[PDB]
Amino acid sequence: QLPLARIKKIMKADEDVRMISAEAPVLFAKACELFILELTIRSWLHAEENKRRTLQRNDVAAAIARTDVFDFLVDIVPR
């Protein structure tokens, strides 16, 4: 579903990242899936509030802005 080597690469951009167990990119692949699914459905709710069947960037920004867990993304995807 998501390439482990690329996950490991993104992980290794970290300051203290050092060595990485094999299980960690595998677990991450599953975590990223859960994150994408939740971000996407929260965004869809904003598209349906605006009477659209197309999910747009402003829908992701809206979902991020009103979800406390997605606080870390508010400056990446401003409304």
């Binding site: 203290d16 299980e23 677990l27 975590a31 990223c32 965004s43 197309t54 990446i76």
Partner: protein
């Protein structure tokens, strides 16, 4: 475009959460693609602090689970923990 997970893989997962006739704009896909990389970096930084505080060299799955709990992703941690225990068996 290689700081990111591949756009089609991300978008295929996005599409699974939506009605079959939903449409996803290319900019929405690119946005979520960028958000996923920030998710990895955000969670890794926390797990790294944990791994280092406990004088270990290797980030493992328990470090990630602890990091997700700390950062407020508690809804994911239960199912990920079960996933991790099965991978290790």
């Amino acid at each position: 475009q290689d700081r990111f997970l591949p756009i089609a893989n991300v978008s295929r997962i996005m599409k699974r959460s939506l009605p079959a006739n939903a449409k996803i704009s290319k900019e929405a896909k690119e946005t979520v693609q960028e958000c996923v990389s920030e998710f990895i970096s955000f969670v890794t930084g926390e797990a790294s602090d944990k791994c280092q505080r406990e004088k270990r060299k290797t980030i493992n799955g328990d470090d990630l689970l602890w990091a997700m709990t700390t950062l407020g992703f508690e809804a994911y941690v239960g199912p990920l923990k079960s996933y991790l225990n099965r991978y290790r068996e």
